[PDB]
DNA sequence: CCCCCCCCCCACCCCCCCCCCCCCCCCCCCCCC
DNA sequence: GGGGGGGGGGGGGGGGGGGGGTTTGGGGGGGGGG
């Protein structure tokens, strides 16, 4: 049931790391979309047998020598070149969520967190949105770890041309609509 | 009784590999089919029509070396190896045997 | 119109790299067939 | 007279070691008040 409960940001303590929590707050900032490599594809110049590296961290080191049996058995130390055509990219975006101004205890600074969102779920958020977000609360390499929330699901807090006839048919609509402008004002 | 210590291996164009199916039998299978020479083309293009097949075959056989260096290796093993001599003389012996 | 204000601008581990050593290959020379 | 084997040189690989990776004051420009 814990994933159902909307936590304020300052309730997200270290013991939650690894859990599919749900957080509540205001988005104070949103990144522009950028691509990130899921799998790098390298061509091999001297044999044409491509090879692949999967990336699973904020950084990586690129391959140099052709590890494929096509080169390795021929002991042919061919050179590898990255191809953006064949590499699988995924859409990446970061958003900073802050607790609601009402939730801040008296005298504390409002606490905030990085949300990372990937794939088709990108650009579901915008600054000034007040929102509930489900995600995996995770560490990142900085013993103190950096931390972020991998977003998974989002809940934002927030025919006619026939229907206009309902007011037109009732008549004197200019006078009435003008009288409908701020009726509490004398 | 003893745990291993590593030593770097090395590979070079052995006459056995040169006599594998993708070796000279590949040349016999494919050279007369793929090289074509004609008065309809200039000398540079005709030379290229030879060189392209031998280069592709050389790379597919032994991709490590450059084509000229491969050719020097081939000329020198041709100068030396007895089984390769028996194969080459067997080719011209087969042509005699026709 | 003149003076004061205020605003701006500026001063420990991991990778790359290099050095050292050992082995293997290739050529040359000599002997054997 | 040519091919094999022995011996010496030269090059390449692999390992090991090492080093690097914001406040305060002052002048001048620009704008506002007496
Ligand atoms: Zn390759």
Which of A73, A75, A77, A79 to mutate to test binding with chain B, by most B CBs within 10 Å of its CB? A75
Solved with = cryo-EM
Backbone angles phi, psi at B20, to 5 degrees: -65, 170
CB contacts, 8 Å: B11 with chain A? 74-75
**Cα A16 from Cα A3, distance rounded (Å):** 11
Q: To one decimal place, what's the resolution in Å? A: 3.2
- DSSP assignments along chain A, one per residue: -GGGSEEEGGG--GGGTTSEEEEEEEEEEEPPPEEEEEEEEEEETTT---EEEE--SS------B--SHHHHTTT---BEEEEEEEEEEEEEEEEEEE--TTTS-TTPPPPEEEEEEEGGGTT---TT-EEEEEEEEEEE---PPEEEEEEEEEEE---HHHHTHHHHTT--HHHHHHHTSSTT--
Backbone angles phi, psi at A126, to 5 degrees: -150, 155
CA of A53 to the centre of ligand 1 (A): 14
Q: Do B63 and A75 touch (CB under 8 A)?
A: no
Joined tokens for residue B60: 């597919």
CB contacts, 8 Å: A74 with chain B? 11, 62-64
């Amino acid at each position: 049931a814990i994933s159902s409960k909307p936590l304020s940001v300052r309730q997200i303590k270290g013991d939650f790391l690894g859990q599919l929590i749900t957080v509540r707050g205001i988005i104070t900032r949103v990144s522009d979309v950028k691509p990130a490599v899921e799998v790098i594809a390298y061509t091999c110049d001297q044999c044409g047998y491509e090879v692949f590296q999967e990336v699973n961290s904020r950084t990586f080191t690129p391959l140099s020598e052709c590890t494929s049996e096509e080169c390795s058995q021929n002991q042919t130390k061919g050179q590898l070149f990255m191809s953006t055509r064949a590499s699988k990219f995924s859409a990446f975006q970061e958003c900073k969520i802050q607790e609601l101004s009402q939730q801040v205890p008296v005298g504390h600074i409002p606490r905030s967190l990085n949300i990372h969102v990937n794939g088709t779920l990108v650009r579901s958020l915008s600054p000034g949105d007040i929102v509930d977000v489900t995600g995996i609360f995770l560490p990142a390499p900085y013993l103190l770890t950096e931390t972020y929330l991998e977003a998974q699901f989002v809940r934002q807090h927030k025919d006619v041309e026939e229907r206009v006839m309902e007011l037109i048919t009732s008549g004197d609509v200019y006078n009435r609509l003008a009288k409908s402008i701020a009726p509490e004002i004398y | 009784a003893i745990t291993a210590r590593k030593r770097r291996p090395q590979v070079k164009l052995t006459a056995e590999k040169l006599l594998s199916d993708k070796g000279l039998p590949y040349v016999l299978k494919n050279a007369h089919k793929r090289i074509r020479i004609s008065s309809k083309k200039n000398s540079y293009d005709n030379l290229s029509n030879i060189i392209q097949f031998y280069q592709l075959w050389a790379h597919e056989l032994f991709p490590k070396a450059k084509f000229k260096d491969f050719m020097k290796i081939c000329q020198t093993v041709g100068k030396t190896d007895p089984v390769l001599r028996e194969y080459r003389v067997s080719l011209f012996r087969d042509e005699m045997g026709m």
